[PDB]
Structure formats: structure tokens, C-alpha cells
Design a protein around this ligand. Structure first.
Ligand SMILES: NC(=O)c1ccc[n+]([C@@H]2O[C@H](COP(=O)([O-])OP(=O)(O)OC[C@H]3O[C@@H](n4cnc5c(N)ncnc54)[C@H](OP(=O)(O)O)[C@@H]3O)[C@@H](O)[C@H]2O)c1
Length: 352
């Protein structure tokens, strides 16, 4: 009954000459006493996968079948299905990444898949849930209550601009914003208008429209105080700053931002902080680990896991590919080239 990991496996990594590589003799991680061992069934592709520690495993989003259980783990059994996030390309843990045949759960940044979800649907969620939570925390917005019967009331609407309303992150975030009593207003391309509205946007606009920031300022009564930038380029930053109200506001982006007097505070989400383990980027010093960041991730996942279970948080629309590891490599290229719109690339792994 003791579990012994396989001697080697296939995983996706980067080699010594900056090329994405299928490695067929990759190591298998050891099983922590407080984690479970996962035979990965599906993975999702994220832009951050495509942005190096050679030979460390790639990939964030996984869903799979529990094949072994740590001695200190309760409430999980062999055969259970789980989904969660890995901390990709981490030099201290190069044998942990979503793009492997076998991984281990990390922290408490995971949950059991609800009976009603498939592996493919569940794999689509982890980075979205994680990022949505970090963005709400940085904006100074409370996470939803999983136990409440309706959102908090605001007789005077509290708007949140979401620049890039068709992004995988925005569609999960806008649902959470709604649950917490906020009213998201989104910008994206016309063909994704229905998607954005279905995911919680009160109104949606084409970001290309002339003088759109004036339109938004007027809509929000010149008091927009929250802007979430899911695109993070020179144009999106300029736009969000122009839309924020006359008295100031808070800009949060999902990436570090390029190079005002506008009374705007600023932050950006650092993905590895969902684990509270720290980060070696950005130099100098990166970030330390912290128990408060760790506890926030666990709390977020306990809340989001229930919301997913209850059908209150739905996955981004899926583009599913049946395949193996070369299909992940291929998926990453489609994503890197900006070739996906309003969909998440998920690969369902064939064994063998
Ligand atoms: N730091 C982190 O841990 C972290 C986590 C999650 C995401 N991110 C970052 O957030 C960004 C979005 O990632 P995601 O996975 O949420 O989204 P995604 O699904 O890859 O977003 C794709 C959408 O972005 C829109 N888009 C692309 N370029 C645009 C531009 N120049 N102006 C306006 N819209 C543009 C398009 O929407 P339309 O076709 O509708 O125009 C496209 O469909 C990426 O840069 C990613 O690196 C970072």
C-alpha cells in the first residue's frame, strides 16, 4: 500500500537553447505528507506559459485523478478527481508543473472536481480563479460569500472597469465581482460582447471606439475608482487612466506595466503569491514567502471551490484538443501568437 512514484515520465520543459521541449525521461515528484499524487488528465494553456529555468516543468492549470494520498491528508481518497494550480518553472521545485503525466497538489491551491464537471472544464479554471482573487485583493474588494443568498446591496452602483472583458481572467473575475456586489463594465471586440455580458458585464464596449474613455467617464459619473487591466500594454494603461474619475482611483494590471499626476494608486498581480512561497522575480530580491499570502490562497480556493460546486462560477469557453504533449507545445504557439479569442485552449491527455 505504500506509494512509489514511477521512475520517469513525460513532461514539457525548456531546453538549454530556449526551445520548448517534450522530455520523455523527466523525473516524477516525491509525495508530500500533506498533498495528493495526481495522474494528470487535462491541462489548460496560459499566456504566462509562453513568456526560463531549463529542465523545470512548464504549466499552471491541471486536473486529474488521485493515485495516492499523503499520510496527513484527510477528506481525499484514491480515485477522487482534483483540479488546481502549479507554480510553473520554479527553480526550487523543477519536478512540479501542470505539463507532466504526474504531479502533486500544491499548498491548498486546489479542490475536488464537482460531480457535474469534466476534467476539461475543471482544468480551464485554476489560473482564472487564482488571478481573479489576487486582482480583487489588490483592488481592495472583498471576496464573495459562498454562503450568501444575494450580493451586497449598493443603491448607488459601484463600477469596476475591466479592460479586456473577453480574456480568460476577465470572464472569471467579472462573475466574482458580481457576486461581491460590484458592477463590471467591459471593453473587448464586438464578437465577444455576448460572452462578456453572459459573464457579468453590465455594458460592454469596443475598445477601438473613438473617445471611448469619455463615454466611460460619463457612464460612471466621473467617479470610476477601480480599473482592472487584463491586457497591460501602452494603450490599455493610457485608456484606464483616462477613464478613472476626477477624484482618483485604483489601477490594477495583470502584468508589470511599461512606462502621471493623476491621483491613481497602482499595483500588479504576481501569480506565484497565490501559494505564499515567494518569487525570485522581479529582481532585485523578488518576493519573500508569507503566511498571510498562503492563507489568502487557501481561503480563496475554499470559497471558489464552493462557488464552482454550486454553479455560481463557470469556466471560460473551451477549445478542447485530444492529444499528448506535442499538442501542448502546439497549443502554446497558438496562444503566444494571440490566435485565440474568447476561448481557453485545453488539452485532454490520451493515456497512452
Ligand atoms: N501575472 C499573472 O499571474 C497573470 C495571470 C493571468 C493572466 N495574466 C496576463 O493577462 C493577460 C491576459 O491573459 P488571459 O489568459 O486572461 O487572457 P486571454 O484569454 O489570452 O486573452 C485573449 C484576449 O485578449 C484580447 N486582446 C489581445 N490583445 C489585445 C489588445 N492589444 N487590446 C485589447 N484586447 C486585446 C483579445 O480579446 P478580443 O478578441 O475580444 O479583442 C483576446 O481574445 C496576458 O498578458 C497574461 O500574461 C497574467
Amino acid at each position: 500500500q505504500p506509494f512509489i512514484p514511477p521512475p520517469q515520465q513525460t513532461a514539457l520543459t525548456v531546453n538549454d537553447h530556449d526551445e520548448v521541449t517534450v522530455w520523455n525521461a523527466a523525473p516524477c515528484p516525491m509525495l508530500p505528507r500533506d498533498q495528493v499524487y495526481v495522474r494528470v488528465e487535462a491541462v489548460a494553456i496560459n499566456p504566462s506559459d509562453t513568456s526560463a529555468t531549463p529542465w523545470a516543468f512548464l504549466g499552471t492549470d491541471y486536473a486529474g485523478t488521485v493515485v495516492a494520498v499523503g499520510s496527513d491528508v484527510t477528506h481525499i481518497q484514491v480515485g477522487d478527481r482534483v483540479y488546481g494550480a502549479q507554480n510553473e518553472m520554479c527553480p526550487r521545485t523543477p519536478d512540479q508543473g501542470a505539463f507532466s503525466q504526474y504531479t502533486v497538489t500544491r499548498g491548498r491551491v486546489w479542490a475536488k472536481i464537482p460531480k457535474g464537471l469534466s476534467f476539461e472544464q475543471a482544468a480551464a479554471l485554476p489560473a482564472g480563479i487564482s488571478t481573479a482573487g489576487l486582482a480583487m485583493k489588490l483592488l481592495g474588494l472583498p471576496l464573495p460569500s459562498p454562503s450568501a443568498d444575494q450580493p451586497p446591496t449598493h443603491s448607488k452602483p459601484v463600477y469596476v472597469l475591466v479592460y479586456g472583458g473577453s480574456t480568460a481572467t476577465a470572464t472569471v473575475t467579472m462573475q466574482m465581482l458580481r457576486l461581491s456586489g460590484y458592477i463590471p463594465i467591459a471593453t473587448c471586440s464586438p464578437h465577444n460582447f455576448d460572452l462578456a455580458k453572459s459573464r457579468g458585464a453590465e455594458e460592454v464596449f469596443d475598445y477601438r471606439a473613438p473617445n471611448l474613455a469619455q463615454t466611460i467617464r460619463t457612464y460612471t459619473k466621473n467617479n470610476l475608482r477601480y480599473a482592472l487591466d487584463c491586457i497591460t500594454n501602452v494603450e490599455s494603461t493610457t485608456f484606464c487612466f483616462a477613464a478613472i474619475g476626477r477624484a482618483g482611483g485604483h489601477y490594477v494590471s495583470l502584468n508589470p506595466f511599461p512606462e502621471t499626476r493623476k491621483m491613481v494608486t497602482t499595483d500588479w498581480t504576481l501569480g506565484p503569491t497565490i501559494f505564499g512561497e515567494g518569487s525570485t522575480w522581479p529582481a532585485p530580491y523578488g518576493r519573500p514567502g508569507s503566511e498571510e499570502e498562503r492563507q489568502f490562497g487557501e481561503d480563496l480556493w475554499r470559497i471558489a471551490g464552493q462557488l464552482v460546486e454550486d454553479g455560481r462560477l463557470v469556466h471560460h469557453p473551451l477549445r478542447v484538443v485530444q492529444g499528448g504533449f506535442d499538442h501542448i507545445k502546439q497549443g502554446m504557439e497558438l496562444v503566444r501568437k494571440g490566435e485565440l479569442s474568447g476561448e481557453k485552449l485545453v488539452v485532454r491527455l490520451e493515456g497512452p
